């Protein structure tokens, strides 16, 4: 999970160039090419909200649960930054809904902290352990209490 054409593919997925990504895939570019921080093109596409590239990469066998150097998966980034469609696509393609990074932070923790309610229910739908604690012992409910998010705390019920 800890992974020239690959560098051009990394930059194309970050910039959102749908045409160039498919060209480089049809020329043998490494779909799991990683940069110095361990971000695959699936990481960058999920971070910058490029939904079309997320499906194109997964079509070509991209590691849906790729780790960066701190243990963060593309689902972590998609859930953290409010990209609901990408969270849908990633979980559909086998993304670990209970993946914990080096700090024990799950995609549910990230969605709850930013108040992404729609993503929170999608993560729970795919079996997100709502009692998952991070390194500090905090759950998604503790985040809702500290932030003062009434809608979140009742979604978590």
């Amino acid at each position: 999970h800890h992974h020239d054409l690959g560098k051009k593919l990394l930059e194309a997925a970050r910039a959102g160039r749908d045409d160039e990504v498919r060209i480089l895939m049809a020329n043998g570019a490494d779909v799991n090419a990683a940069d110095v921080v361990g971000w695959t093109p699936l990481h960058l596409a999920a971070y910058w909200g490029h939904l079309e590239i997320v499906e194109v990469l997964l079509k070509n066998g991209a590691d849906v649960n790729a780790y960066d150097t701190l243990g963060s998966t593309p689902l972590h980034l998609a859930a953290h930054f409010g990209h609901l469609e990408i969270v849908e696509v990633l979980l559909k393609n086998g993304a670990d809904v209970n993946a914990k990074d080096d700090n024990g932070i799950t995609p549910l923790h990230l969605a709850a902290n930013r108040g992404h309610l729609e993503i929170v229910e999608v993560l729970l739908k795919y079996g997100a352990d709502v009692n998952a604690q991070d390194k500090f012992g905090k759950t998604a409910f503790d985040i809702s209490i500290n932030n003062g998010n009434e809608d979140l705390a009742e979604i978590l019920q």
């Binding site: 940069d35 110095v36 361990g38 971070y47 960066d68 701190l70 080096d102 700090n103 932070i105 500090f136």
Partner: protein
């Protein structure tokens, strides 16, 4: 030309957003009541540097404009961070381009690049800067400082933090006013009067090494050299220069607004003649750029590139002039870390000096033909804008507090539409830098309080170790210079090193950073731009062949009018 005043401030170890939100905005919000101010622009870099350029109307007295700017900045000084004030803020009224470059080398190889830089800064720069007509002096290098290179393993072994090292340096590298014996008003019949001399500034690595940090329980002593390597080193390590491939330092001299370019150059050489008889053995002045006979080459790597990769490109540039252009080029002065637009680990510059014009016969050996050939030769260098030299200027503006991320998207939207009109606009590009990965670390306030670890100790340990801290001054061979505390390189390179740093809690227990922190990767700006007080992004470009600049500019205005709500624009520079 419209006169321009430049404000420069530094924040050691600060990111671009920290610089902008504690320095740049504060200064900008206080640039009021100044006469004939055309517009204002600024850059906030992740080198910890801010540059605010205030351009004035044509005919404005540059003397009056500089004074009014300096006086407004003085009243805003108490609003800036203490770390920025003590670095010294500068306000200059000079041209943007260099009048000349004074190069310094050692023909006997007995002095390294760092030695030459300190000598130039400590013995040459000030008298050059005080010469009339010299508006700005750029040292290609750094002055020595007392560098305390901390070791986190040894600090934790003795239950000490960078806070303890900083406190001891201030207490034991001190200059104390102690009064006099028999001072006034004195008693009747007093016979003796003499100054009392108490502590004085340290002057050597030996004295800094024996600073007493603490006495152990068994009576043994913990000295500063037991937790740190102590050596003379630059205030920063960002600017390294070479002359024809050998180590060098130097001074980039800019002409003051309105000064005589030829009289200033002569006065600079007269001052240099005063310094030469006292140079150490081997030191020699070279003149690699006298303002044709001269031209420049800029080197721009993408944001995120390190010093080593930029130096590789500079090597190829220097190699080309030293081999392919043997018969035409006399010297190449190449500077790594300093570029056209501010400093950076991803930017560089080369000053090229040609042989005697009489010894370069033929049109193909003139400056324009040479710069053209060099640009085409450097055009095949990957991920590097390398141009040799001897359109419109557009500013996208955040008008409704949209923020950096949304302004980038609105910029990308404008660039993509301009790319769909190759018939009118060519090479419509951003002038600034792109977002790069950065390390976001969150301090857990609950765990810190539960463990009795103060936030001040946490942020000081983190900032001093990983970013460096200007403690106070010392006297190096009779000259006041700075003292810097920072982690030794090998303990501040990888994210896992974060956990190797310990902070002492209120109960005396050592607590690792991993116990109260969490971290993740994210993207952020290495250079934030502002125009007339608002967030902005400068866009450059020229008209397509066979089209006037007005036609290209108007098309840009049409495309800008279909941008998201809150995104404005304005013309600047030549387009103003």
């Amino acid at each position: 030309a419209p006169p321009a005043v430049t404000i420069s401030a530094s924040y050691p170890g600060a990111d671009a957003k920290t610089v902008q939100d504690t320095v740049t905005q504060v200064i900008e919000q206080n640039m009021n009541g100044i006469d004939n101010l055309m517009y204002m622009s600024s850059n906030s870099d992740s080198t910890g540097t801010v540059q605010i350029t205030l351009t004035f109307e044509s005919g404005t007295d540059a003397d009056i404009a500089q004074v009014q700017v300096q006086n407004k900045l003085q009243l805003a000084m108490p609003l800036l961070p203490q770390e920025v004030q003590q670095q010294g803020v500068s306000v200059e009224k000079s041209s943007s381009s260099f009048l000349m470059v004074v190069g310094v080398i050692n023909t006997d190889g007995t002095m390294t690049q760092e030695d030459i830089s300190d000598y130039v800064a400590a013995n040459m720069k000030d008298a050059i800067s005080r010469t009339s007509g010299v508006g700005d002096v750029q040292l290609f290098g750094s002055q020595y400082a007392m560098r305390i290179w901390m070791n986190p393993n040894e600090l934790n072994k003795f239950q000490l933090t960078p806070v303890d090292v900083i406190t001891a340096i201030k207490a034991q590298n001190a200059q104390v006013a102690a009064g006099q014996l028999g001072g006034t008003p004195p008693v009747k019949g007093q016979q003796l009067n003499a100054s009392i001399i108490a502590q004085t500034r340290l002057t050597s690595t030996e004295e800094f090494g024996k600073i007493l940090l603490k006495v152990n329980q068994d009576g043994s002593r913990v000295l500063l050299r037991d937790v740190a390597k102590i050596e003379l080193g630059g205030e920063n390590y960002d600017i390294i220069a070479e002359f024809n491939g050998q180590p060098a330092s130097g001074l980039g001299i800019k002409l003051a607004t309105g000064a005589n370019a030829l009289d200033t150059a002569a006065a600079i050489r007269a001052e240099l003649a005063k310094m030469e008889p006292f140079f150490p053995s081997g030191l020699k002045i070279v003149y690699p750029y006298d303002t044709q006979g001269v031209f420049m080459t800029m080197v721009q790597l993408p944001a995120g590139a390190t010093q080593e990769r930029t130096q590789k490109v500079l090597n190829e540039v220097t190699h080309y002039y030293l081999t392919k252009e043997k018969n035409n080029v006399e010297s190449v002065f190449a500077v790594n870390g300093f570029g056209f637009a501010g400093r950076g680990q991803n930017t560089g510059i080369a000053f090229v000096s040609l042989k005697d014009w009489a010894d370069r016969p033929g049109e193909e050996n003139k400056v324009e033909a040479i710069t053209m050939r060099a640009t085409r030769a450097f055009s095949q260098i990957k991920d590097a804008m390398v141009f040799a030299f001897n359109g419109f200027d557009f500013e996208l503006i955040d008008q409704a507090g949209l923020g950096h991320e949304k302004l980038t998207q609105a910029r990308n939207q404008l660039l993509a539409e301009a790319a769909k009109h190759p018939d009118m606009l060519t090479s419509v590009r951003p002038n600034g830098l792109e977002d790069t990965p950065q390390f976001k670390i969150d301090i857990d306030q609950e765990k810190a309080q539960a463990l009795g670890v103060s936030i001040n100790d946490i942020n000081t340990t983190l900032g001093a170790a990983w970013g460096g801290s200007y403690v106070n001054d010392f006297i190096d061979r009779g000259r006041v210079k700075k003292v810097y505390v920072m982690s030794e390189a090998k303990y501040r390179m990888l994210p896992d090193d974060i956990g190797d740093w310990y902070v002492r809690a209120a109960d005396g227990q050592m607590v690792p950073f991993s116990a109260f922190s969490s971290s993740r990767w994210e993207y952020g700006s290495p250079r934030l731009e502002r125009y007339n007080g608002l967030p902005s992004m400068e866009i450059l470009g020229q008209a397509a062949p066979g089209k006037s600049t007005g036609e290209a500019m108007e098309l840009m205005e049409q495309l800008a009018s279909k941008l998201p709500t809150g995104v404005g624009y304005d013309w600047t520079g030549m387009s103003y």
